[PDB]
Amino acid sequence: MEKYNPHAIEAKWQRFWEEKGFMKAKDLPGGRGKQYVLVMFPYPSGDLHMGHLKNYTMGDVLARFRRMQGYEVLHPMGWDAFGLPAENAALKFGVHPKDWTYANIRQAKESLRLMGILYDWDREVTTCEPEYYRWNQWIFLKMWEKGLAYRAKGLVNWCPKCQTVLANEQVVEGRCWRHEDTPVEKRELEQWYLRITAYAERLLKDLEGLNWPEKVKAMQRAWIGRSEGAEILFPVEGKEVRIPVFTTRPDTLFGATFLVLAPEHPLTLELAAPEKREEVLAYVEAAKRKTEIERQAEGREKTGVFLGAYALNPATGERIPIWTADYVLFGYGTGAIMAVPAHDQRDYEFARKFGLPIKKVIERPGEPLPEPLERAYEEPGIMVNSGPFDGTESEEGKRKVIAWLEEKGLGKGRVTYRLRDWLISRQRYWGTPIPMVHCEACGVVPVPEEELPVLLPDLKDVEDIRPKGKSPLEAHPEFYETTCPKCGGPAKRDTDTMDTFFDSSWYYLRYTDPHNDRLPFDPEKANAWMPVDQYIGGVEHAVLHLLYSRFFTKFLHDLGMVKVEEPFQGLFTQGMVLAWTDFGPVEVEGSVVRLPEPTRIRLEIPESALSLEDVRKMGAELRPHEDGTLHLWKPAVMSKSKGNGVMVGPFVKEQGADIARITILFAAPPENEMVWTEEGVQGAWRFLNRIYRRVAEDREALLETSGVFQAEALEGKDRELYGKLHETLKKVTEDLEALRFNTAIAALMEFLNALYEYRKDRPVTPVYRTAIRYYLQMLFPFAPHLAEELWHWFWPDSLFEAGWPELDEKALEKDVVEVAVQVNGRVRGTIHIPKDAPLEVARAEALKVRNVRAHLEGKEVVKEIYVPGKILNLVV
RNA sequence: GCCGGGGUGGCGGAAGGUAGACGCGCAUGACAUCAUGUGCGCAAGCGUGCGGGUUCAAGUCCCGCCCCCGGCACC
Ligand SMILES: CC(C)C[C@H](N)C(=O)O
Ligand SMILES: [Hg+2]
Ligand SMILES: [Zn+2]
Numbered sequence: 001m002e003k004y005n006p007h008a009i010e011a012k013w014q015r016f017w018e019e020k021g022f023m024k025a026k027d028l029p030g031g032r033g034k035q036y037v038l039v040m041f042p043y044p045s046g047d048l049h050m051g052h053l054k055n056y057t058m059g060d061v062l063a064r065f066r067r068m069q070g071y072e073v074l075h076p077m078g079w080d081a082f083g084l085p086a087e088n089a090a091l092k093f094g095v096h097p098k099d100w101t102y103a104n105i106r107q108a109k110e111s112l113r114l115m116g117i118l119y120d121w122d123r124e125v126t127t128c129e130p131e132y133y134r135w136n137q138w139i140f141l142k143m144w145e146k147g148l149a150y151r152a153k154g155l156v157n158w159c160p161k162c163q164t165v166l167a168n169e170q171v172v173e174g175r176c177w178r179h180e181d182t183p184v185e186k187r188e189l190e191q192w193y194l195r196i197t198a199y200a201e202r203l204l205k206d207l208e209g210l211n212w213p214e215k216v217k218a219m220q221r222a223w224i225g226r227s228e229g230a231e232i233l234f235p236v237e238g239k240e241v242r243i244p245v246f247t248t249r250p251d252t253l254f255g256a257t258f259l260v261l262a263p264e265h266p267l268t269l270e271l272a273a274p275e276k277r278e279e280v281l282a283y284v285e286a287a288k289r290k291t292e293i294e295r296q297a298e299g300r301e302k303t304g305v306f307l308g309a310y311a312l313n314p315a316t317g318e319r320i321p322i323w324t325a326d327y328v329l330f331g332y333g334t335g336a337i338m339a340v341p342a343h344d345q346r347d348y349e350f351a352r353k354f355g356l357p358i359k360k361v362i363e364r365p366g367e368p369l370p371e372p373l374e375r376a377y378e379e380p381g382i383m384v385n386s387g388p389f390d391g392t393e394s395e396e397g398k399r400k401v402i403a404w405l406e407e408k409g410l411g412k413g414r415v416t417y418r419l420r421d422w423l424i425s426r427q428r429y430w431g432t433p434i435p436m437v438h439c440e441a442c443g444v445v446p447v448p449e450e451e452l453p454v455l456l457p458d459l460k461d462v463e464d465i466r467p468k469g470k471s472p473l474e475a476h477p478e479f480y481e482t483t484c485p486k487c488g489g490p491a492k493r494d495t496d497t498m499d500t501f502f503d504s505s506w507y508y509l510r511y512t513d514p515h516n517d518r519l520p521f522d523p524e525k526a527n528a529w530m531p532v533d534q535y536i537g538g539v540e541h542a543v544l545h546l547l548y549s550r551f552f553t554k555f556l557h558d559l560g561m562v563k564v565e566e567p568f569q570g571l572f573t574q575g576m577v578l579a580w581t582d583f584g585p586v587e588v589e590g591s592v593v594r595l596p597e598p599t600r601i602r603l604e605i606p607e608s609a610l611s612l613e614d615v616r617k618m619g620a621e622l623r624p625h626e627d628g629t630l631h632l633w634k635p636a637v638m639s640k641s642k643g644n645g646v647m648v649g650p651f652v653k654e655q656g657a658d659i660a661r662i663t664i665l666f667a668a669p670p671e672n673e674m675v676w677t678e679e680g681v682q683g684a685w686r687f688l689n690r691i692y693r694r695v696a697e698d699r700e701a702l703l704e705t706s707g708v709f710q711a712e713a714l715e716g717k718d719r720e721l722y723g724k725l726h727e728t729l730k731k732v733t734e735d736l737e738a739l740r741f742n743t744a745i746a747a748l749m750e751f752l753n754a755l756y757e758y759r760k761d762r763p764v765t766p767v768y769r770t771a772i773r774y775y776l777q778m779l780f781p782f783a784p785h786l787a788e789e790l791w792h793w794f795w796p797d798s799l800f801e802a803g804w805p806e807l808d809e810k811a812l813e814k815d816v817v818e819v820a821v822q823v824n825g826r827v828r829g830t831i832h833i834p835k836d837a838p839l840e841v842a843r844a845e846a847l848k849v850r851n852v853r854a855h856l857e858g859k860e861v862v863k864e865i866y867v868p869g870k871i872l873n874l875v876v
Numbered sequence: 877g878c879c880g881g882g883g884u885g886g887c888g889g890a891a892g893g894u895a896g897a898c899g900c901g902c903a904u905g906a907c908a909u910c911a912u913g914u915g916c917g918c919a920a921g922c923g924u925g926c927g928g929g930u931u932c933a934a935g936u937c938c939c940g941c942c943c944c945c946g947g948c949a950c951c
């Protein structure tokens with residue numbers, strides 16, 4: 001008997017699936033239904049390795065299942081060549097981006113293919129191309145003319161590693177997104193934004209119906225950040241200006257004893273009294289320079305200045321000082337607060353600190369507040385010390401006092417959003433050139449549609465396009481030295497670019513019609529596939545791409561080009577692939593693991609000594625090693641950086657794809673994190689041969705056998721198996737639909753076992769062949785190649801055409817169950833009787849069990865409880 | 877602190893009514909591989925975060941805490 005040879009089959013069939021273009025995406029889905037399966041596309045920057053390959057595989061299993069079910073299936077792939085991710089890397093290995101990007105691609109495709117992944121490569125999309133980014137601009141313009149693209153001054157964030165700015169959603173922990181070490185500083189810059197706050201309520205209210213993981217939803221609810229409230233207006237002393245302040249407790253207005261403008265408020269220095277102007281000017285250059293790391297290092301300690309102005313209280317109608325504490329933020333609300341310190345601890349502690357008087361206005365129910373009050377009273381109650389309101393309920397207070405202002409024109413009700421507009425000007429060569437020129441007569445004038453695309457200049461000095469501080473395009477005037485399209489005057493093109501996240505906010509829509517040279521896509525095409533039914537990807541994009549994209553799909557829908565409104569109907573988040581990683585040498589002594597200082601640094605503890613048990617409980621082993629010493633290993637995250645990634649290309653050659661796939665599929669649930677391992681890769685190697693051999697041992701014994709038989713005339717063991725099969729199908733099929741591929745497969749192996757146990761007493765019968773025909777189609781999604789090899793030993797056509805095996809519900813009907821006997825809960829033993837076999841029978845068959853355990857303690861009995869399914873309990 | 881999601885064999889995990897499917901590791905029997913056994917306890921008996929409890933039957937239901945992971949935390 002021959003053996004399973006990956007290298008014999010796996011690459012042969014690949015060549016075939018492409019030639020016979022199965023996953024060729026249809027243009028305009030007709031009858032049988034549609035399914036759009038999508039893996040988030042890769043920034044090309046590194047060679048791929050299992051760690052990456054998890055997600056891509058998912059989508060592919062999924063996609064063969066749909067296509068096996070006869071759905072019309074779009075499973076596309078492309079790249080994310082533009083913006084920081086690539087360039088960053090290119091530069092880090094001094095390579096010109098085009099050469100690097102069109103190279104990292106080639107390698108990527110070759111991995112994906114190797115594994116057995118299939119796409120419709122006639123839809124490939126290289127964002128960095130002009131072919132594409134032309135539209136990224138087309139969008140920008142359509143966005144400008146609808147008021148939603150603009151420039152504006154303000155505090156941008158600065159990444160010195162990247163030598164550019166980033167949007168707020170790229171500042172995680174308080175640090176650059178792709179550099180989880182380099183903190184970001186603030187800088188004053190007129191820059192381009194996209195007005196995303198014009199969609200805040202929609203972005204929030206449309207989440208409700210969206211079937212996403214509660215975790216991405218929950219993050220997007222809080223980040224967008226609704227707050228109902230009211231904009232009150234404080235006149236400044238004598239000055240014709242007035243000061244707006246967001247409050248969620250306008251029922252305190254009388255308790256206002258001062259105001260606090262956020263450090264970089266225009267009105268901070270503009271009102272600064274010329275005595276205190278010196279101290280106030282120092283506190284800004286202090287604030288600005290201090291970063292989001294150090295703000296939390298300081299702790300929640302209050303710190304400020306008195307400006308030397310005043311402000312009238314709308315309500316009481318008297319003066320009060322105005323301060324500039326940094327505990328009010330400027331990128332939210334007004335950048336200014338009415339500060340009641342008697343009902344809000346933050347302000348209390350500012351009042352408790354800088355002697356700023358503290359006024360009570362909301363007296364507590366039954367038991368009253370003390371005087372002096374020694375902390376805040378944030379909970380609500382009855383209004384006091386507030387003139388005509390004296391007696392009112394704090395809850396009703398809000399809407400009344402709001403209403404009271406709405407008359408006198410002193411204020412209004414409003415709903416600010418935490419969402420801050422999406423900055424996209426990047427000071428980098430690599431990235432879409434913003435399609436706007438700067439005029440001298442006519443302001444800042446757009447570019448005509450038909451003039452597009454605004455191509456990047458070509459720049460072949462690698463050590464030129466390195467980003468120095470200002471835009472790398474500035475150094476090249478010829479680019480910007482152009483005319484206007486409004487009159488014809490002197491004209492500097494904008495030297496800035498679009499962030500990579502831009503292109504990654506509709507690529508899903510581009511895939512539907514990826515050669516259209518007139519639009520970003522013919523809508524008839526978009527609507528024919530969208531929404532995406534399955535977006536297979538990860539949490540790290542919860543408030544970035546998965547926010548940006550939607551706003552884009554909304555605004556594209558608000559030009560009426562896409563009918564839907566949420567682009568992904570089905571987000572499925574996935575787990576990181578972990579590997580066992582060598583951490584370094586260790587000095588063992590009896591039962592005391594001493595840690596040298598590079599191996600402790602790498603572990604990230606402070607300790608040097610450890611018990612062997614201390615190693616265990618942090619989930620690590622100590623192994624031998626090449627160098628002679630003992631070495632400590634612990635699962636760590638599979639990255640290039642960690643130097644622990646299982647490489648796809650090499651790995652395929654010295655093992656296989658299907659084994660790759662079974663390994664990354666059958667370990668953990670998909671949404672869990674998993675650990676790729678020798679122990680598991682072998683598991684695969686076993687499971688895949690028990691498939692092979694069992695169909696090899698029966699190759700002759702099948703050919704001369706027909707897979708036709710009268711369903712209800714199978715008796716005995718042919719009757720059992722056929723049941724088990726169909727029970728199995730139901731589980732393989734229900735667990736494909738759920739995306740539960742771990743257990744899905746387990747359930748496939750269980751039958752294989754049972755198929756070995758079938759053949760032990762029972763030769764190749766029709767049932768068994770049909771048991772195989774089925775098994776192999778049930779295998780095609782995961783182990784497609786070994787699944788195709790065995791099929792074609794018998795059948796003339798591909799598994800893709802074979803159709804998803806149809807379920808026979810009446811095989812699931814259980815007859816002669818195994819039913820557990822218990823007496824007072826303790827499961828004494830099990831008996832075998834038909835489902836409906838009534839109470840009177842079970843009694844009989846129990847009374848004389850394996851160890852007559854039912855009698856052992858059943859010498860009384862009072863009530864008795866049968867239940868047809870699987871239980872019979874005797875009481876006492 | 878708030879939100880989000882988890883505490884079940886030696887491991888990843890499976891699931892009101894036989895807890896521990898399937899695999900890994902371990903252990904013996906075959907000519908690495910297949911077969912066979914494997915919650916724990918020598919046993920009495922015990923076991924799904926910890927305590928009560930409701931139920932003939934609780935991983936599953938109720939009341940009261942605990943703890944780990946992820947994110948947001950002067951908004
Ligand atoms: C969907 C995309 C924003 C994904 C991104 N290109 C990445 O590689 O993570
Ligand atoms: Hg390109
Ligand atoms: Zn950076």
Ligand SMILES: [Zn+2]
Pocket residue numbers: 439441442445484485486487488489
């Ligand atoms: Zn002009």
